[PDB]
Design an enzyme around this catalytic site. Structure first.
Site, PDB file in Angstrom:
ATOM      1  N   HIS A  15       3.970   6.280  11.443  1.00 13.07           N
ATOM      2  CA  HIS A  15       5.217   5.512  11.473  1.00 13.07           C
ATOM      3  C   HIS A  15       6.427   6.382  11.823  1.00 13.07           C
ATOM      4  O   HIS A  15       7.456   5.860  12.245  1.00 13.07           O
ATOM      5  CB  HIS A  15       5.472   4.831  10.124  1.00 13.07           C
ATOM      6  CG  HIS A  15       4.940   3.432  10.019  1.00 13.07           C
ATOM      7  ND1 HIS A  15       5.129   2.486  10.998  1.00 13.07           N
ATOM      8  CD2 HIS A  15       4.261   2.808   9.022  1.00 13.07           C
ATOM      9  CE1 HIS A  15       4.568   1.347  10.624  1.00 13.07           C
ATOM     10  NE2 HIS A  15       4.044   1.517   9.428  1.00 13.07           N
ATOM     11  N   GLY A  36       0.802  -1.200   0.000  1.00 11.60           N
ATOM     12  CA  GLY A  36       0.000   0.000   0.000  1.00 11.60           C
ATOM     13  C   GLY A  36       0.837   1.252   0.000  1.00 11.60           C
ATOM     14  O   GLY A  36       0.629   2.137  -0.827  1.00 11.60           O
ATOM     15  N   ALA A  37       1.768   1.342   0.946  1.00 13.00           N
ATOM     16  CA  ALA A  37       2.606   2.522   1.056  1.00 13.00           C
ATOM     17  C   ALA A  37       3.839   2.223   1.892  1.00 13.00           C
ATOM     18  O   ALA A  37       3.989   1.124   2.429  1.00 13.00           O
ATOM     19  CB  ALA A  37       1.825   3.671   1.649  1.00 13.00           C
ATOM     20  N   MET A  38       4.723   3.203   1.999  1.00 13.41           N
ATOM     21  CA  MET A  38       5.986   3.003   2.687  1.00 13.41           C
ATOM     22  C   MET A  38       6.425   4.264   3.426  1.00 13.41           C
ATOM     23  O   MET A  38       6.435   5.361   2.868  1.00 13.41           O
ATOM     24  CB  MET A  38       7.056   2.559   1.689  1.00 13.41           C
ATOM     25  CG  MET A  38       8.386   2.253   2.315  1.00 13.41           C
ATOM     26  SD  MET A  38       8.217   0.848   3.624  1.00 13.41           S
ATOM     27  CE  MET A  38       9.652   1.349   4.799  1.00 13.41           C
ATOM     28  N   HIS A  62      -1.566   6.431   8.615  1.00 18.85           N
ATOM     29  CA  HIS A  62      -0.674   5.311   8.916  1.00 18.85           C
ATOM     30  C   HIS A  62       0.794   5.632   8.644  1.00 18.85           C
ATOM     31  O   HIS A  62       1.633   5.505   9.539  1.00 18.85           O
ATOM     32  CB  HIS A  62      -1.093   4.081   8.103  1.00 18.85           C
ATOM     33  CG  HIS A  62      -0.329   2.836   8.438  1.00 18.85           C
ATOM     34  ND1 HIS A  62      -0.820   1.875   9.293  1.00 18.85           N
ATOM     35  CD2 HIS A  62       0.873   2.376   8.010  1.00 18.85           C
ATOM     36  CE1 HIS A  62       0.048   0.883   9.391  1.00 18.85           C
ATOM     37  NE2 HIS A  62       1.083   1.161   8.618  1.00 18.85           N
ATOM     38  N   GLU A  63       1.116   6.067   7.428  1.00 21.40           N
ATOM     39  CA  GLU A  63       2.520   6.264   7.075  1.00 21.40           C
ATOM     40  C   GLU A  63       3.118   7.393   7.911  1.00 21.40           C
ATOM     41  O   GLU A  63       4.265   7.303   8.341  1.00 21.40           O
ATOM     42  CB  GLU A  63       2.700   6.564   5.578  1.00 21.40           C
ATOM     43  CG  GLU A  63       2.147   5.515   4.641  1.00 21.40           C
ATOM     44  CD  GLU A  63       2.496   4.096   5.045  1.00 21.40           C
ATOM     45  OE1 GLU A  63       3.626   3.849   5.523  1.00 21.40           O
ATOM     46  OE2 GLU A  63       1.627   3.218   4.885  1.00 21.40           O
ATOM     47  N   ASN A  96       9.188   5.691   4.460  1.00 18.18           N
ATOM     48  CA  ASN A  96      10.582   6.145   4.435  1.00 18.18           C
ATOM     49  C   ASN A  96      10.704   7.553   5.018  1.00 18.18           C
ATOM     50  O   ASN A  96       9.921   8.443   4.683  1.00 18.18           O
ATOM     51  CB  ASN A  96      11.163   6.138   3.014  1.00 18.18           C
ATOM     52  CG  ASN A  96      10.715   4.948   2.196  1.00 18.18           C
ATOM     53  OD1 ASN A  96      11.178   3.818   2.394  1.00 18.18           O
ATOM     54  ND2 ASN A  96       9.820   5.199   1.251  1.00 18.18           N
TER      55      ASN A  96
HETATM   56  N1  LIG Z   1       5.844  -0.680   6.330  1.00 21.55           N
HETATM   57  C1  LIG Z   1       4.951  -0.629   5.144  1.00 21.55           C
HETATM   58  C2  LIG Z   1       4.997  -1.971   4.395  1.00 21.55           C
HETATM   59  N2  LIG Z   1       4.570  -1.801   2.924  1.00 21.55           N
HETATM   60  C3  LIG Z   1       5.722  -1.553   2.000  1.00 21.55           C
HETATM   61  C4  LIG Z   1       6.356  -2.873   1.444  1.00 21.55           C
HETATM   62  C5  LIG Z   1       6.792  -3.942   2.283  1.00 21.55           C
HETATM   63  C6  LIG Z   1       7.358  -5.117   1.730  1.00 21.55           C
HETATM   64  C7  LIG Z   1       7.507  -5.239   0.321  1.00 21.55           C
HETATM   65  C8  LIG Z   1       7.076  -4.188  -0.521  1.00 21.55           C
HETATM   66  C9  LIG Z   1       6.498  -3.003   0.047  1.00 21.55           C
HETATM   67  P1  LIG Z   1       3.132  -0.193   5.693  1.00 21.55           P
HETATM   68  O1  LIG Z   1       2.686  -1.203   6.736  1.00 21.55           O
HETATM   69  O2  LIG Z   1       2.295  -0.221   4.454  1.00 21.55           O
HETATM   70  O3  LIG Z   1       3.269   1.227   6.290  1.00 21.55           O
HETATM   71 ZN   LIG Z   2       2.942   0.219   8.304  1.00 20.97          ZN
END
Ligand SMILES: N[C@@H](CNCc1ccccc1)P(=O)(O)O
Ligand SMILES: [Zn+2]
Length: 865
Positions: free
Chosen positions: A295, A255-257, A291-292, A259
């Site tokens: 984090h 979904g998202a990341m 959520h992001e 960073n």
């Molecule tokens: N920590 C994030 C994990 N999503 C990204 C991700 C992880 C593994 C493989 C490819 C992409 P989220 O829980 O969405 O905030």
């Molecule tokens: Zn997360």
């Protein structure tokens, strides 16, 4: 085969204090140079670096290193006894990277995804989260092709080269693990805003999107500003940089990341307008943007010692995004939605061959553990601290958590200890929520003798594949009492006379004494879903009607309805099997009639009360399952409700249209009416499929936003009329240039209950807007088919063979998508013999593939062996 074990954890032999990176982006290759400042922790040990990129050179203190490269590990045996530098040069071809891990190309632009272990695809590094370093990133690229060059932190320098290139330098002053590294390079449009922190510091907000999608980013920007304000007011947490960037990308696995300072999002969780996005899409953007951001503290400022501790950041951050969404609007409804999703998707996981603890004891491929258990059950575990301690006590724990562990990589045990220590309470038994897999099962009995209500409760946890011994757990059970007229009855428990209490079950069997009860009562149990468990209490059909009509807790009312539906389906299974008329369901129909006619009910809540449990919920606990029998029984119930109340479905639809009042933009209030309206539409078209032609005639007038178009297309999707096909084709044509809407089209193709879905799906594979290498598309079409019960579980095995074909094909370039898809086969052992045989043949054929990923291999092994 390499297995990773939590019990084998050992601190790293080496720390990386400083990580300087240089990216030279060319066509087609990108050359990456690193300078690592390395600090020995265990002097004399070999330096072991993880990496899979093409290696050009390795230096220790400027000199060519004596090293060996074996598999994906680079080892240097002769390293200095004090601080030294390591310089690595690697070469990457991002356009060839279809795994979407590491550095990859999408839409002519470059993006990264490093969590969990993608950074080692960029350079050779100690790629584990307990190694935290301070990153500085220089990027060089053609200016016209890549005018936007981004990485984590603050931009501290930049300039031009006279050959059309330019460069930037980014410095992230916060030490971080490698999985939080990000880089973006491309031709992207920017949307700018800002937030002022409570200490008076402006934070520049920048959202990067394609030029065409920029007009759709406004709601995400507003949601971010709401999330920033909320973390301040609810948790006292402030942002720590003067810049926060969000980048949308259409090729993305999850979904998202999060960073640091440079979040990267799947477009589906950033882009919306009322024309192209549903109300549910908007709610999703709000949740994930929150959520992001959340984090930043729960994940980034405090991170994970090892990947076994993933729920430390995900369970807690999910809990935070749930509370954020709840505080925004419709808390009770949104809570029910979360419970529903847990029981529909997490419970079957805990009951199946891939069941694992919230904190696993082992894994082969970590990407297989970004699961409903780690996330959603993880959040339920965090919420139980809240239930046990109260909001005030919970915040005391949070405060001590950050006081102790800011800047550290820690464990689930440390979070628990913070909660325990800050509140002076013993939570030792609570640890079992992290280490014991499986859904606990409570059995309760109630008796009113004298003026005491005696509630006896037993608990048990089933063996799971990883562990047979399950000890009694700490389970908070929230309770209340109702009298014959369904009003709240007071009782005495532990000194206090109240109408509600939290009973703390800690033993295998306990009796709770609710005393001072002066009326006949039925109990209301597990209020607010106070623990993630199965609860069996002897309720009569009339007890359930009483709870549904009069109970004050949203979950218990909803659970009462869910039970009536479950019983009705079981009755249908019985008659259909005996070859007789369907049951009457007189009690159920009376209850639903009351719900339909009750105007005190929140409309979104009413919609939930009119939702029938999915097939998966219905066959939970069953053996030798014929999925089509459960489908037939559920369909029969839905058709009875549709035909029986057809007049009232129309009337409720009319009321909903009138109350919506041409307010087609997203708002929680409008959304509730539309949700109810879309339930009515589904029922109308079940009872009177010919109504589709009336719908078609007025489609333009009704298509006032995507919630309506989706609602209508969803309602007709199983219709055998040619008009269904025409409406879908018109939808695809109207929104051909909108990738996120085309995802909806493909989802409808894949999920249709029509008899011809397999061949329509195969045709859709060849649609010019379909791409198997795009996760959103693959999931929409193939994922949806794999969850399409009558077709995936077709008796001839065509559904199994098709999905096994696609697991095999997809695994050749994206094992993550393939490893999620193959879990469609998780029900294997519980299927009746004919289908079971066919599923095992499919899994054997997958296993027999040369070069099968570790990802898919791990899952297949759990199911097969
Ligand atoms: N920590 C994030 C994990 N999503 C990204 C991700 C992880 C593994 C493989 C490819 C992409 P989220 O829980 O969405 O905030
Ligand atoms: Zn997360």
């Amino acid at each position: 085969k390499t297995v990773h074990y939590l019990k084998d954890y050992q601190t790293p032999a080496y720390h990386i204090l400083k990580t300087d990176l240089h990216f030279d982006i060319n066509e087609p290759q990108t050359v990456v140079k690193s300078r690592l400042t390395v600090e020995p922790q265990r002097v004399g040990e070999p330096l072991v670096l993880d990496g899979s990129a093409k290696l050009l050179s390795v230096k220790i203190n400027g000199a060519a290193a004596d090293y060996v490269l074996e598999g994906e590990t680079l080892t240097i045996a002769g390293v200095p006894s004090e601080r030294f530098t390591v310089e690595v040069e690697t070469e990457i071809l991002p356009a060839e990277n279809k795994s979407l891990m590491g550095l990859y190309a999408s839409g002519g632009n470059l993006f990264t995804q490093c969590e969990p272990e993608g950074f080692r695809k960029i350079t050779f590094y100690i790629d584990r989260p307990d190694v935290m370093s301070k990153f500085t990133t220089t990027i060089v690229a053609d200016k016209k092709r890549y005018p936007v060059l981004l990485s984590n932190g603050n931009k501290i320098d930049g300039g031009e080269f006279s050959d059309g290139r330019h460069w930037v330098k980014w410095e992230d002053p916060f030490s971080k693990p490698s999985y939080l590294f990000a880089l973006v390079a491309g031709d992207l449009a920017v949307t700018e805003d800002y937030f002022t922190t409570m200490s008076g510091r402006n934070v520049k907000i920048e959202f990067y999107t394609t030029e065409a999608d920029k007009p759709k980013v406004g709601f995400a920007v507003e949601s971010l500003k709401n999330a920033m304000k909320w973390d301040e007011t609810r948790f006292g947490l402030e942002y720590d940089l003067d810049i926060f960037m969000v980048v949308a990308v259409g090729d993305f696995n999850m979904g998202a990341m999060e960073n640091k300072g440079l979040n990267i999002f799947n477009t589906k969780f950033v882009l919306a307008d009322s024309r192209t996005a549903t109300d549910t899409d908007f709610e999703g953007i709000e949740s994930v943007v929150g959520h992001e951001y959340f984090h930043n503290w729960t994940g980034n400022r405090v991170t994970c010692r090892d990947w076994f501790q993933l729920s430390l950041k995900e369970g807690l951050t999910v809990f935070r995004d749930q509370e954020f969404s709840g505080d925004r609007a419709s808390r009770a409804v949104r809570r029910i939605e979360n419970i529903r999703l847990l029981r529909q998707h997490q419970f079957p996981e805990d009951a199946g061959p891939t069941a694992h603890p919230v904190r696993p004891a082992s894994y082969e491929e970590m990407n297989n553990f970004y699961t409903m258990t780690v996330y959603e059950k993880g959040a339920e575990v965090v919420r139980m601290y809240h239930t046990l301690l109260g909001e005030e006590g919970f915040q005391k724990g949070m405060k001590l958590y950050f006081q102790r562990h800011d800047g550290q990589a820690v464990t689930c045990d440390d979070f628990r200890a913070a909660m325990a220590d800050a509140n002076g309470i013993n939570l030792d038994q609570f640890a079992l929520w992290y280490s014991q897999a499986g859904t606990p099962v409570l059995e309760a009995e109630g008796r009113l003798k004298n003026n005491i209500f005696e509630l006896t409760v037993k608990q048990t946890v089933p063996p799971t594949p990883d562990m047979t011994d399950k000890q009694p757990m700490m389970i908070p059970v929230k309770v209340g009492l109702l009298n014959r007229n369904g009003e709240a009855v007071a009782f005495d428990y532990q000194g206090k006379r109240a109408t509600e209490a939290v009973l703390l079950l800690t033993e295998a069997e306990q009796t709770f004494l609710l005393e001072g009860v002066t009326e006949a009562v039925v109990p209301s149990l597990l209020r607010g879903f106070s623990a993630p468990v199965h609860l069996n209490y002897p309720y009569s059909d009339d007890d359930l009607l009483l709870l549904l009509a009069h109970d004050s807790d949203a979950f218990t009312r909803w659970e009462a309805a869910q039970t009536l539906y479950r019983r009705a389906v079981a009755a249908n299974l019985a008659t259909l099997s005996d070859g007789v008329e369907l049951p009457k369901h007189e009690k159920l129909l009376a209850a639903v009639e009351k719900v339909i006619s009750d105007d005190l009910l929140d409309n979104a809540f009413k919609a939930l009360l009119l939702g029938v449990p999915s097939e998966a919920e219905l066959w939970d606990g069953a053996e030798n399952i014929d999925p089509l029998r459960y489908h037939q029984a559920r369909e029969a119930l839905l058709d009875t409700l549709a035909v029986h109340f057809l007049p009232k479905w129309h009337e409720l639809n009319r009321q909903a249209a009138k109350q919506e009042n041409q307010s087609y933009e997203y708002s929680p209030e409008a959304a509730g009416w539309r949700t109810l309206r879309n339930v009515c539409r589904a029922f109308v078209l079940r009872a009177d499929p010919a109504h589709i032609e009336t719908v078609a005639e007025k489609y333009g007038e009704m298509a006032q936003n995507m919630t309506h178009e989706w609602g209508i297309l969803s309602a007709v999707n199983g219709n055998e009329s040619d008009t269904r096909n025409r409406l879908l084709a018109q939808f695809a044509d109207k929104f051909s240039d909108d990738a996120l809407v085309m995802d909806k089209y493909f989802a409808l193709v894949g999920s249709s209950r029509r008899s011809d879905t397999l061949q329509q799906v195969r045709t859709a594979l060849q649609h010019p807007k379909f791409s198997l290498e795009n996760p959103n598309k693959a999931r929409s079409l193939i994922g949806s088919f794999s969850r399409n019960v009558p077709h995936f579980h077709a008796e001839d095995g065509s559904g199994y063979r098709f999905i096994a074909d696609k697991v095999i094909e997809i695994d050749r370039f994206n094992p993550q998508v393939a490893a999620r898809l193959v879990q469609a086969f998780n029900l294997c052992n519980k299927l009746e013999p004919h289908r079971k045989n066919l599923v095992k043949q499919a899994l054997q054929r997958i296993r027999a593939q040369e070069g099968l990923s570790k990802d898919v291999g791990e899952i297949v092994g759990k199911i097969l062996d």
